[PDB]
Amino acid sequence: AVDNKFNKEFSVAGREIITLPNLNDPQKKAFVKSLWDDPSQSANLLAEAKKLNDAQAP
Amino acid sequence: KFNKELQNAVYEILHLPNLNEEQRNAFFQSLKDDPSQSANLLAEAKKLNDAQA
């Protein structure tokens, strides 16, 4: 049983999403829930959140 | 039955500024092992966060 340390990858990715200033509250919460459910996709999900954050810049 | 309490505790613990990543990892690992302690672990994380201001 390989343990990918996916929970620690969740905390690193979740911290990065919380610091994205242009996402709104439900957007951030949606990414966090997706990270928690499938932490194997932590890097893909952070990449999507950064794309969305950059697209919503003032 | 704790999907709201878990998601809330997870989201608030991520925001706590005074925690280190290892402490933050420990709470996440306990939440994944027993989500029924979401309120207790969140209260513990905030208390720990207040003591490390």
Author numbering:
A (entry chain B): 0 to 57
B (entry chain A): 4 to 56
According to the publication:
The three orthogonal mutants, LL2.c17 (VFLV/IVVY), LL2.c7 (LVLF/FIVK) and LL2.c22 (IVFF/FILV), were selected to compare differences in their affinity and structures. Each Z-A mutant binds to its binding partner with nanomolar affinity (3.98 to 44.2 nM) but has minimal cross-reactivity with other monomers. The backbone structures of the three mutants are relatively similar (Cα r.m.s.d. of Z-A after aligning Z-B ranges from 0.447 Å to 0.641 Å). The other two mutants, LL2.c7 and c22, have clustered pi-pi and pi-cation interactions at the interface (Phe31A, Lys35A, Phe9B, and Trp35B). Additionally, the same compensatory mutations (positions 17A and 31B) as LL1 mutants are also seen from LL2.c7 and c22 mutants. All mutants except for one (LL2.c1) had a higher fraction of nonpolar BSA than the original dimer (58%), and all mutants except for one (LL2.c7) had a higher packing score (PackStat) than the original dimer (PackStat of Z/ZSPA-1 = 0.640). For example, A-LILFK has more Z-B binding partners (B=77) than A-LIFFK (B=15) from the LL1 library, and A-LVLF (B=53) and A-VFLV (B=42) are also more cross-reactive than A-IVFF (B=3) from LL2 library sequence data.
We adopted the Z domain of staphylococcal protein A and its affibody binder dimer complex as a model system. We next generated libraries at the interface of a weakly associating dimer (Z+ ZSPA-1) with micromolar affinity to determine if we could affinity-mature the interface by coevolution. To clarify these inter-residue co-variations discovered from the sequence data, we determined crystal structures of 10 coevolved pairs that spanned a range of cross-reactivities and orthogonalities (5 from LL1 and 5 from LL2). From the structures, we could verify clear compensatory changes between the residues showing the most significant covariations (13A-9B / 17A-31B) in both LL1 and LL2 library mutants.
